[PDB]
Every structure is written in structure tokens, then in C-alpha cells.
């Protein structure tokens, strides 16, 4: 007991957490491990995802080297207060904080051979932006950016340690509404006139899944716009029937619209979906538009031609429309 | 006319026994079993499956909705669920159907659910020949071996739900064929 | 003295394990008056230390069969740092401790049962010992009865009115037909306000679906029914064809299409409803 | 049981063995005039 | 210096409203004969441009002069 003691006394002393290790010598080589937990949340109003995940360093120092102890050493997390860590950081963060409850989640271990491995439980708020122009049929390319502040490439190096095993945990991830397709490491140098500094970044693709549109968004509306199409087959006198067809079609689509976007992200950015529900608005209002031309020419001035013509063209032409649509965003 | 009464009935007891059992094989997951020689206990239906978790209980924890497409491990999957519940539908608006003896005539009617049973059992063909292939899923050849493959049982088992497909697919057959010399008769 | 209770300020001196609950976003102790915190020793050599938290643990909700869905809410924990050869946690045994239910915070859902459970996980820097403890919960339907199931099904039986007003009646029927379309989109808008944004559809949801179609459908049929009614105007037995499709002639019984469909939409609704709520409630 | 499914899968063929029975025993029956 | 996008607002109001109004305007050429036809379609038009003012003051404040 008192030998343990004694050994980690020394150790302490004579340890400057002003001075790097090797502050003369090479950079110090720094591994990064990375474990998500949870992705809480991910947002398209705010661009940006909290992440809640057990981020591990690993580092070689020598001042921290002691012998004839072959059990390793997990000391008080508040022990990490009294030793040399990294300035890393996320760039793209815009508010992170670690769990402090019961006790500060943080951990500190050293081995025989001098190493240090610092783990923290860190929850951020990292940002990406979401390229919504094909909102909801649209993949999203988010990144966890990690670097040094202050020291450059000849001071400091990251690296991922266990290369592509260096991020897990991906498969426990379940989001609601996106499904993680892949997950890439990055490990690489920004140059700048003064110098290089080391960067990281962990960049995962995700998914929308649309079926919940598909159910509520896009089968209402094509079932809307062919209710439109039944006014073409009611008889041409029926003026009261066909307008009130027309006109709550269009009612109800409006409701439609207005509806939507109270529930989709509260960005004025132009989507998808908008272009999908202002083609099938356009469609229902002419397809009152076709009953004023006909209540004009032959009632108001053996089917009649602008009845026969409608009923094979409104729905080719919302046909050809599916196709560019479906074509053009897919 | 007693005779083509009670052989109606009777046909539309059948015709109700078909498609109780279509929901459940629809419904239940016992499609394939683990084995001695599977890694891991467990089995997957059309769309969902329940996996070891990986202790001595192992919780059946179970994952997979044909609500939800993006949970189904593998494209045929999603094509064999469709088939089948293809065929769901198509027997219930027979069993709907059985309504217009009311008023159309017999024939018409027994026709009429000849050929929605028939493409019940056709829908039901498909959903089988498909299903297989999706055994080589990246989760079914974790599961079911790695040897398991399209069409390959390999170091896993078979349950009661996916020979009773077969069944249910007999019983389609000769149901359809009855109703057919029925509505002549 | 054989048991001397401490102070909340010196405890950090004293060591203490590295508790922490695994599946919690965020957690707090209430700092005032004084802090929440307290310990005791025991001069055979025990220790006791007490807190007080308010853990906002999460709970991944499978809502595929929403509202009908039952929950296994986790609440987990494990040292932070000490692998299991250096802390081995346990319970007290013989159960868990819980106050009265009625006076819960549980609105939405019914509490049913406590279970509790222990594991050794197999992460990257060791093998930690983890104790969960989980709370199963059942939702209560009463608010999506009245809200969802019942104004739709009576929107639906209010589509089926139209079979039993008068053909002629072009205006009333193309009305009540696309008013009811309306109407089933309106709460359609709302049926989803209290869950989540979750990408897949729910029980609630495929309800909802098979109403607007059983909507659409009967006023479909209607314009079916306006457009004939007034603009238009070997082996066994014999052929195999005639064992096949009757397809004579063929239409002339289709003004009586209103009788069929008395019957057929009913039925079919009535099908739906038992397959459903037979695969939701017991087969499922 | 862990892997034990001789049972359902025996009792499984008989019940559908015995439906089928009774389907072609009907069909059969309306067959002769 | 920042300059608003438009292209949002224009097909979420400009459009719909612009073609709300072309449809009262289908009133004048249906028969005059028709009141029920024309009466429904003025006044359900004219709902139709109540529901659609809503959604104008979404993404803004409060302002009490109009925009
Ligand atoms: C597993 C246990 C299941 C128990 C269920 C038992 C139900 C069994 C019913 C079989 C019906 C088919 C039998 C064959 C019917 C053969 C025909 C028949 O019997 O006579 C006709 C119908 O009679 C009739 O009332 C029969 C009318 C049809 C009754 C069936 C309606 C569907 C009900 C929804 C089904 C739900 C099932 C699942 C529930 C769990 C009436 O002659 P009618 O000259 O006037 O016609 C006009 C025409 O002559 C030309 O104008
Ligand atoms: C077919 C041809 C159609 C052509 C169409 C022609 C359309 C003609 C355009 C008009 C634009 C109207 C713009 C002004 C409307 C807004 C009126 C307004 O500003 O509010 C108060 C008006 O005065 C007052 O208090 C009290 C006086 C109230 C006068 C409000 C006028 C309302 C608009 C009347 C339109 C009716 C049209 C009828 C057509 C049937 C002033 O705020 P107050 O100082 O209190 O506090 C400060 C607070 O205003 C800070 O924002
Ligand atoms: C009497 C008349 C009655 C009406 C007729 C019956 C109407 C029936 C209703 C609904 C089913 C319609 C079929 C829908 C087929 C679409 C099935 C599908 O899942 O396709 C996804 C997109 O495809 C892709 O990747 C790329 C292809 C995208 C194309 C999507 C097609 C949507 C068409 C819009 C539907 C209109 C239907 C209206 C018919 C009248 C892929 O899945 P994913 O892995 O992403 O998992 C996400 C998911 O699991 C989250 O819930
Ligand atoms: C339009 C008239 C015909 C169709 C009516 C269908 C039932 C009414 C709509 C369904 C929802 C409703 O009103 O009640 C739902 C509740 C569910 O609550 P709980 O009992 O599960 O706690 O109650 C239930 O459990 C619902 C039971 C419904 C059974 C299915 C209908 C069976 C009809 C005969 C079939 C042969
Ligand atoms: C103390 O920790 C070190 C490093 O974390 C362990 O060293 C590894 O131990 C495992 C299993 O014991 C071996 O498979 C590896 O080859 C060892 N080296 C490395 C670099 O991983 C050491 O075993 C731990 N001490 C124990 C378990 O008593
Ligand atoms: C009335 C006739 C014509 C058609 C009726 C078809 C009904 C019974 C069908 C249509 C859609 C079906 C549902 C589709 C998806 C699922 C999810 C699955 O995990 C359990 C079964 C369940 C919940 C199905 C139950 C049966 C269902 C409701
Ligand atoms: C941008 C669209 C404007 C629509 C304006 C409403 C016109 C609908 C009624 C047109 C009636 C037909 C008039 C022309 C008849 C003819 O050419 O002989
Ligand atoms: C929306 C595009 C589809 C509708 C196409 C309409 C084609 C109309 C062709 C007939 C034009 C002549 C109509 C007047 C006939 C007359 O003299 O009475
Ligand atoms: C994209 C996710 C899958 C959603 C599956 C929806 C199935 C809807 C079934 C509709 C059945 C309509 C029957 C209408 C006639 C009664
Ligand atoms: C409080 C428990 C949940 C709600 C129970 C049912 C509420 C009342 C239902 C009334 C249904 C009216 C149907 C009328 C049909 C003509
Ligand atoms: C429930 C009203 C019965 C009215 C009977 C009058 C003759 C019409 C026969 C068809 C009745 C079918 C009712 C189907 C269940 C609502
Ligand atoms: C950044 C693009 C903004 C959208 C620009 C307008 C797109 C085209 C709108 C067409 C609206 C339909 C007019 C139909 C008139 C009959
Ligand atoms: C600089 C971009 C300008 C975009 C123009 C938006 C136009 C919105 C539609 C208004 C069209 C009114 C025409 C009425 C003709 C009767
Ligand atoms: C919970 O844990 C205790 C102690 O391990 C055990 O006695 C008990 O059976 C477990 N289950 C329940 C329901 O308390
Ligand atoms: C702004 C989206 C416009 C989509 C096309 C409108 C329908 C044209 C049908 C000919
Ligand atoms: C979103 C792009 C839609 C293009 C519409 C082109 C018109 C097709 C119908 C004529
Ligand atoms: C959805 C279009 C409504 C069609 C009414 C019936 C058309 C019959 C054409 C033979
Ligand atoms: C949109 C209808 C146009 C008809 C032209 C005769
Ligand atoms: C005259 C009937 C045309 C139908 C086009 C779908
Ligand atoms: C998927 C779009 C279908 C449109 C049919 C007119
Ligand atoms: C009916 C044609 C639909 C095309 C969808 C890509
Ligand atoms: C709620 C259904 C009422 C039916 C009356 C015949």
C-alpha cells in the first residue's frame, strides 16, 4: 500500500503542467478513440446535432513513467487537474458540456510504461449544415472536426488509434427520423503561411427516411389532385357540383400546405416537398379553370371536346410530372 | 340445392380458415428457427426478428415492423411482406365480397373470389420464392451461419410459419378450383 | 459515538466510487438551502453515502404500435473508470423501494412492474459491471379514443351516408363526398402533434390512412356511379373459358351499384377494424 | 427446448395435412355428378 | 450586408394567392343563372384567402406596421 503511495508522491512532483512532454524534443503523437453513446437529437432549424460520447486520448509521457507496479493505476478523476493534457477541440461546436453528476465523468489512467489515457463523457452540440434543396429525399454529410488551439504539426500530432476501429458504438445509434448509411475517419494536416496544424474529423452520412411524407404528405396530395380529376366526368350542366368540387379540391389542399409546414423545420429555404405540393396545386386549379372554359363556351355562350381532351391529358400530364419530379430528385 | 348450400358454406368457412391463417403467418416471425449449429438463438419472420442479445437469457429482445421499411434487413424482404400482404388483401375483399351473394347472382360472386383466391395464392407463391433470398442479409448471416445464403439452410433451422405459407398456398388452390366449378354449377 | 454522521462539505475528501448512471443526457443535484448531499460512517468500517438527484434518463420508445405500445424503461449505472477487478457493485436484495403510485407523475402512461438486473459490458478499456433497473409502462388510450378513432370512424360512417341520399342529388353527395375528404384530412393534421417526429407510421396513423382511402373510395364510386347512370347512357361443362371468366356480353347492373355498396363498405370497414385491433391489441 | 422443434413443426403438418384433407374431400365430392 | 431570399415566400404566398384571385375572377364568366355555383365559389375563395393570410407572419415578428 504505502509503496504505491510513495511512487505516485514522486511521480507528482517534479511535474510542470505548463511544459508539454518533450517540450525540446519531437511532437508528442496523440491517439484518439471515440465512442458515441447517443445522438440525442438532430436538427435542420438549427443545423446541428447533439452527440453524447465517451472520447478517449492516449498519450506517452515520460515524467509519468514509474516501475515495479505491473497492476495499472486508475487513479481520481480529479487527479487529471494535476497532469499535462492536449488543447484539443471541436471546431465546429457550439455548446458541449461533460456530465458532472454523481461525480465529474472523467477518468484518468497510467500504465507501467509512462502512457497516460484521458476519457471524458462529453455531450456537444457539433454543427453541419443540411443541403435541404432535396428536403425530404436528401442525404446529410455531418462531421465532428477535432484540433489542437494553440500548437501546430511540430508540436503536437493526432491520430486515430486502432485506425477504422477507432470510432464504435455506430450500431447502437437508432435515430428517428435518419439511418446511418456509413461512417469515415479523416486524419490530416491544415497548412497555413505560419504552419501546419493537425486535424481530425469523424464524418458521418445519414439517411432521411421518408415514409412518414410518403404517407401523409405525398398520397394525400396525389389522392386530392385526383379527386380533381372525377370533376371532368360529371356532366357539364352540373355547375353547383363541378365548382363545388373544384373550389374545396383546392381548399383542401390549401389546408394541406398550411398545415405542413407547422410540423416540417422552420426554415424559409425553398425544398422538395414545396415543388411537390405547388405542382399538384397548380393542377387542381386547373382543373377548375378547365370547368370555367367549358361552363363559358358551350353553356354560357356526345361529350364535349374540352372534357374528353382533359381526361386523358390531366392525368398524362401529372403522370409525365411524377416522372421528371421523381426523375430529377432521385 | 341443399347440396350447393352446404358445400357454400362450408367453402366459406374454408375461405375465412385461409385467411386467418394468411394474418397469422403474416403476423408471426416462427418463419425460421436457430439450430445446434447456429451461432446464435434467435429467428426472423417477413419483417421482424429477434435476435440473442448475447447472455444466458438473452432477453428475446426483437426488432423489425412492416410499418417500418428502413428496419427490414434486406430488399426481398421487403418484396416477400408486400407479396403477402398482397394476398391478405386480396382475401379479405373476398371475404368483403361474400356480401354480394345479397344481391348478384351465385355465380358471378363465386367467380369472383375464384380468381381473388387464386391471386391470393399466386401473391402468396411469389412471397415465398422470394423470401429465401434474403437470407443472405448481413444480420440473417450473423444469425443463421455464415455458410446460410440465398436459397442455403446452412447451420440454422426451419419453423411452422414458413411450411404453413405452403400450406395456406394448397389451401388457396383448391379453393379458387372449388369456387370455379361452383359458380358453373 | 458508533455512528458518526459527516458534514456535506468535507466528503470530497473521503473517497467515493465513480457512480455513474449510463444512460442519462443530464443530471443535478439541488444545491440550496444547503447541499443535497449527506454521508455516515460506522466504526466497524462502513460507509453510507446518500444524494439526491433528478435524472432525465432516456428510454429508446419503440412506437411502431402507438397507442397501444408498452415500454421496459431502463435506468443504468456502472463506475466510470474502475474496470469490474477493481469495483463490483450490488443490490440490498429483497426488492426495490417505491413510494406510492398514485401520487406519481404518470399521466400518460401506467405503471405495471420493477424489475432489476446485472451484466458486465466488454468496452475498450476493460470490463465494467453494470446494473440496470427497469420500470415497464402501458399507455393509456382514453385521450386518442375520443380524439382520433371515434371522430374518424364516425367521419367514415358519415361517407357512408352518401350511399342513402338520391342519385340526382349531384351537389349533395359531390359535397358531402369531398367535405368528408376534408374533414379526415383536418384531423389527419393533428393525429400526430403528440409524437415525435418519428420518420416511420404508427397504428394511429395506418388507422388514419385506411379511413381517408375508405373516404376517397366512396366518393369515387360516386362519380362512377354519375358518369354510367346518365352520360354514358372441352374438358369439364363446356369452354374452358366458360369454367373461367363468365365475361358474357361484357355494364347493364351497374345503376344498382348504391346496393352493393351499402354492404361492401361497411363490411370491408368492419373487416379492417377487426384484423386490426385483433393484430394490435392481442396477436401483436 | 433451445433448439427443440420437432413438436410444432409435427403438429403444424398434421392440423394443415388434416385442412387439406377436408378442402379436397369437399372438392371431390362436388367433382362427382 | 445581408439580402433576404425570396424564392421561399414567393411559392409559399405570391403564387397561391395570385391564383385565388384568378379563380374569383372564374366567377364572372360561369352563368349568372348558376347561384349556388358562384356564391359557393366566391365565399369558399374567400376562405380559402383567410387560411392562406395565416401563414404569412410565420418567420417574423410582431411588427405593428405592415410589411
Ligand atoms: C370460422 C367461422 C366462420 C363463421 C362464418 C359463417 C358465415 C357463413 C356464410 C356463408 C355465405 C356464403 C354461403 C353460400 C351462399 C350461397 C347463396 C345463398 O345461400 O343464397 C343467397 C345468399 O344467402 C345468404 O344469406 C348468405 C349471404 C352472405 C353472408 C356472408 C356476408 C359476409 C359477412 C362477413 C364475413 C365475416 C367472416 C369472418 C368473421 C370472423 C340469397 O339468395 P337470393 O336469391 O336472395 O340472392 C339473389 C340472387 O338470387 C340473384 O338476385
Ligand atoms: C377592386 C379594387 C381593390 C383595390 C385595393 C385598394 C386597397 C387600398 C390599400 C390600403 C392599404 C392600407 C394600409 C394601412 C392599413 C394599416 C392601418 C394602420 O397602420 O394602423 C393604424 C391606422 O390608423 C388608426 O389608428 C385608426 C384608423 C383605422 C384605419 C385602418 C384602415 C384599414 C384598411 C382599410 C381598407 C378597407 C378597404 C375596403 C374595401 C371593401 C395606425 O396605427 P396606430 O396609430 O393606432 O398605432 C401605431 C401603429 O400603427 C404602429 O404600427
Ligand atoms: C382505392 C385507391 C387506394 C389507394 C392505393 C393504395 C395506396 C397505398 C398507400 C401507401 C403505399 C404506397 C407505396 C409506397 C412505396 C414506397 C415504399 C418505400 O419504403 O420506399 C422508400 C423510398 O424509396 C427509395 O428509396 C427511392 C425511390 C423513391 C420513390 C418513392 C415512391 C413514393 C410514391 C408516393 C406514394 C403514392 C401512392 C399513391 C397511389 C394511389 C424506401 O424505403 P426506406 O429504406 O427509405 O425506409 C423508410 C421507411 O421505412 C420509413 O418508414
Ligand atoms: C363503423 C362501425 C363499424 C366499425 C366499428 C369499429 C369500432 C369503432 C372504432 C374503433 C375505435 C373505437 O371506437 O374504440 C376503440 C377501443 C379500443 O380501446 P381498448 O378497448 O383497446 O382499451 O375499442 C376497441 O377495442 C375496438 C373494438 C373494435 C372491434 C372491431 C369491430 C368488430 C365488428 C364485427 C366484426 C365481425
Ligand atoms: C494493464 O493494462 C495494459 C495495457 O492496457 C495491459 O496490457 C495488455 O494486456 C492484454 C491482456 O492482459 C494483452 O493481450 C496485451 O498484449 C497487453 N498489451 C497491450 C499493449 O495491450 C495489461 O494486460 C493490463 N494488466 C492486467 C490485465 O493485469
Ligand atoms: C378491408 C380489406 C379490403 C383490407 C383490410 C386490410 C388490413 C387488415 C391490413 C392493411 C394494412 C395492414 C397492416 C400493415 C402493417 C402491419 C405491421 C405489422 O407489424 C403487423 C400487421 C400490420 C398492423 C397490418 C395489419 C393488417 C392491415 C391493417
Ligand atoms: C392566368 C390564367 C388567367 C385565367 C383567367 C380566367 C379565364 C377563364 C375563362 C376563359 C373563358 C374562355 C374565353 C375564350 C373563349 C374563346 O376563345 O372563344
Ligand atoms: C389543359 C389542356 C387540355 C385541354 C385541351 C383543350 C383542347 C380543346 C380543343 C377544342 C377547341 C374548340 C372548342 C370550341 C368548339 C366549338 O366551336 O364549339
Ligand atoms: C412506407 C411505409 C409502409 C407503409 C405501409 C402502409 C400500408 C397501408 C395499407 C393500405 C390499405 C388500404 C386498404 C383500402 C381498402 C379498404
Ligand atoms: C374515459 C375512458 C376513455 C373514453 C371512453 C369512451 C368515451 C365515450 C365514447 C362515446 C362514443 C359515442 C358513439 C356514438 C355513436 C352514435
Ligand atoms: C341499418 C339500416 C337498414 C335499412 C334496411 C332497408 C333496406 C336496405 C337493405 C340494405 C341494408 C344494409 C345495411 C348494412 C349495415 C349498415
Ligand atoms: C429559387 C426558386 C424560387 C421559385 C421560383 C418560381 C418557380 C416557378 C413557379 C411557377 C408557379 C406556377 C405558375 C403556374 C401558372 C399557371
Ligand atoms: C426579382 C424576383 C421577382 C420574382 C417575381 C415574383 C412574382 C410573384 C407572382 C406575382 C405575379 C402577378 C402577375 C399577375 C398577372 C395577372
Ligand atoms: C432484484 O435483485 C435482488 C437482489 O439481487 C433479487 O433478490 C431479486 O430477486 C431481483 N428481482 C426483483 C424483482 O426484485
Ligand atoms: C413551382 C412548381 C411548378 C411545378 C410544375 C407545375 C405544373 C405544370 C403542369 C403542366
Ligand atoms: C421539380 C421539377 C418539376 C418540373 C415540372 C416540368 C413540367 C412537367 C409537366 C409538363
Ligand atoms: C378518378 C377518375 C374517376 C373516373 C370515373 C369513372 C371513369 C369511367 C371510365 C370508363
Ligand atoms: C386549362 C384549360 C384550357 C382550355 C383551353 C381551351
Ligand atoms: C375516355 C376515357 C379516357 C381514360 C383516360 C385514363
Ligand atoms: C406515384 C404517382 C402516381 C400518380 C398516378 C397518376
Ligand atoms: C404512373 C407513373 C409514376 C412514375 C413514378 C416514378
Ligand atoms: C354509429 C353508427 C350508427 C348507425 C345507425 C344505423
Known amino acids: 500500500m504505502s509503496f504505491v503511495k510513495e511512487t505516485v508522491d514522486k511521480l507528482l512532483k517534479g511535474y510542470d503542467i505548463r511544459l508539454r512532454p518533450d517540450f525540446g524534443g519531437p511532437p508528442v503523437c496523440v491517439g484518439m478513440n471515440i465512442d458515441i453513446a447517443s445522438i440525442d437529437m438532430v436538427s435542420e432549424v438549427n443545423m446541428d446535432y447533439t452527440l453524447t460520447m465517451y472520447f478517449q486520448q492516449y498519450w506517452r509521457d515520460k515524467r509519468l513513467a514509474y516501475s515495479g507496479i505491473p497492476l495499472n493505476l486508475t487513479l481520481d478523476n480529479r487527479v487529471a487537474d494535476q497532469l499535462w493534457v492536449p488543447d484539443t477541440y471541436f471546431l465546429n461546436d457550439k455548446k458541449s458540456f461533460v456530465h458532472g453528476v454523481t461525480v465529474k465523468n472523467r477518468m484518468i489512467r497510467l500504465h507501467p510504461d509512462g502512457t497516460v489515457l484521458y476519457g471524458l463523457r462529453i455531450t456537444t452540440t457539433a454543427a453541419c449544415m443540411m443541403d435541404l434543396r432535396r428536403y425530404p429525399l436528401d442525404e446529410q454529410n455531418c462531421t465532428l472536426e477535432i484540433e489542437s488551439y494553440g500548437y501546430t504539426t511540430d508540436d503536437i500530432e493526432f491520430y486515430w488509434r486502432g485506425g477504422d476501429k477507432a470510432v464504435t458504438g455506430v450500431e447502437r445509434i437508432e435515430l428517428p427520423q435518419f439511418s446511418i448509411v456509413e461512417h469515415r475517419l479523416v486524419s490530416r494536416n491544415v497548412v497555413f503561411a505560419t504552419g501546419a496544424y493537425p486535424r481530425l474529423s469523424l464524418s458521418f452520412r445519414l439517411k432521411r427516411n421518408i415514409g412518414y411524407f410518403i404517407l401523409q404528405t405525398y398520397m394525400p396530395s396525389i389522392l386530392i389532385t385526383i379527386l380533381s380529376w372525377v370533376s371532368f366526368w360529371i356532366n357539364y350542366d352540373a355547375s353547383a357540383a363541378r365548382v363545388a368540387l373544384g373550389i374545396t379540391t383546392v381548399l383542401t389542399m390549401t389546408t394541406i400546405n398550411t398545415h405542413l409546414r407547422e410540423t416540417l423545420p422552420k426554415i424559409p429555404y425553398v425544398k422538395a416537398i414545396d415543388m411537390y405540393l405547388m405542382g399538384c396545386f397548380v393542377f387542381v386549379f386547373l382543373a377548375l379553370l378547365e370547368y370555367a372554359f367549358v361552363n363559358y363556351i358551350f353553356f354560357g355562350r356526345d361529350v364535349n371536346a374540352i372534357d374528353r381532351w382533359s381526361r386523358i391529358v390531366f392525368p398524362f400530364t401529372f403522370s409525365l410530372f411524377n416522372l421528371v419530379y421523381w426523375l430529377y430528385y432521385v | 340445392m341443399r347440396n350447393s348450400r352446404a358445400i357454400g358454406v362450408l367453402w366459406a368457412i374454408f375461405t375465412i380458415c385461409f385467411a386467418i391463417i394468411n394474418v397469422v403467418v403474416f403476423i408471426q416471425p416462427y418463419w425460421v428457427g436457430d439450430s445446434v449449429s447456429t451461432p446464435k438463438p434467435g429467428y426472423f419472420g417477413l419483417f421482424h426478428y429477434c435476435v440473442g442479445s448475447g447472455l444466458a437469457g438473452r432477453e428475446l429482445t426483437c426488432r423489425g415492423s412492416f410499418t417500418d421499411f428502413s428496419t427490414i434487413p434486406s430488399s426481398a424482404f421487403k418484396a416477400a411482406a408486400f407479396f403477402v400482404l398482397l394476398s391478405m388483401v386480396l382475401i379479405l375483399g373476398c371475404i368483403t365480397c361474400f356480401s354480394l351473394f345479397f344481391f348478384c347472382n351465385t355465380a358471378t360472386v363465386y367467380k369472383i373470389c375464384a380468381w381473388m383466391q387464386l391471386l391470393a395464392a399466386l401473391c402468396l407463391v411469389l412471397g415465398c420464392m422470394i423470401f429465401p433470398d434474403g437470407w443472405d442479409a448481413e444480420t440473417i448471416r450473423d444469425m443463421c451461419g455464415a455458410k446460410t445464403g440465398k436459397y442455403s439452410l446452412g447451420d440454422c433451422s426451419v419453423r411452422w410459419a414458413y411450411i404453413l405459407a405452403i400450406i395456406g398456398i394448397l389451401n388457396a388452390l383448391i379453393l379458387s378450383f372449388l369456387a370455379f366449378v361452383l359458380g358453373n354449377r | 459515538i458508533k455512528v458518526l454522521r459527516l458534514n456535506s462539505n468535507m466528503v470530497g475528501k473521503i473517497w467515493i466510487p465513480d457512480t455513474f448512471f449510463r444512460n442519462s443526457k443530464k443530471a443535478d443535484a439541488h444545491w440550496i438551502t444547503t447541499p443535497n448531499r449527506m454521508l455516515r460512517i460506522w466504526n466497524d468500517g462502513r460507509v453510507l453515502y446518500t444524494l439526491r438527484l433528478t435524472i432525465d434518463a432516456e428510454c429508446q420508445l419503440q412506437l411502431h404500435n402507438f397507442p397501444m405500445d408498452e415500454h421496459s424503461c431502463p435506468l443504468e449505472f456502472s463506475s466510470y473508470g474502475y474496470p469490474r477487478e477493481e469495483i463490483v457493485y450490488q443490490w440490498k436484495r429483497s426488492s426495490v423501494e417505491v413510494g406510492d403510485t398514485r401520487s406519481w407523475r404518470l399521466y400518460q402512461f401506467s405503471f405495471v412492474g420493477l424489475r432489476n438486473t446485472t451484466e458486465v459490458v466488454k468496452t475498450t478499456s476493460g470490463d465494467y459491471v453494470v446494473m440496470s433497473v427497469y420500470f415497464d409502462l402501458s399507455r393509456r388510450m382514453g385521450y386518442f379514443t375520443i380524439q382520433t378513432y371515434i371522430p374518424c370512424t364516425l367521419i367514415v360512417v358519415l361517407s357512408w351516408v352518401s350511399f342513402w341520399i338520391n342519385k340526382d342529388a349531384v351537389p349533395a353527395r359531390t359535397s358531402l363526398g369531398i367535405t368528408t375528404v376534408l374533414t379526415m384530412t383536418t384531423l389527419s393534421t393533428i393525429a400526430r402533434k403528440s409524437l415525435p417526429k418519428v420518420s416511420y407510421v404508427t397504428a394511429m396513423d395506418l388507422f388514419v390512412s385506411v379511413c381517408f382511402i375508405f373516404v376517397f373510395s366512396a366518393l369515387v364510386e360516386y362519380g362512377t356511379l354519375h358518369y354510367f347512370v346518365s352520360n354514358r347512357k372441352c374438358l369439364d361443362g363446356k369452354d374452358c373459358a366458360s369454367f373461367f371468366c363468365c365475361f358474357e356480353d361484357c355494364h347493364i347492373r351497374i345503376a344498382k351499384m348504391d346496393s352493393y355498396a351499402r354492404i361492401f363498405f361497411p363490411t370491408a370497414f368492419c373487416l379492417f377494424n377487426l384484423v386490426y385491433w385483433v393484430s394490435y391489441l392481442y396477436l401483436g | ?33
Open chain 4, 1 to 33: 427446448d433451445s433448439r427443440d422443434y420437432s413438436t410444432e413443426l409435427s403438429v403444424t403438418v398434421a392440423v394443415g395435412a388434416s385442412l387439406l384433407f377436408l378442402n379436397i374431400l369437399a372438392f371431390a365430392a362436388l367433382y362427382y355428378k
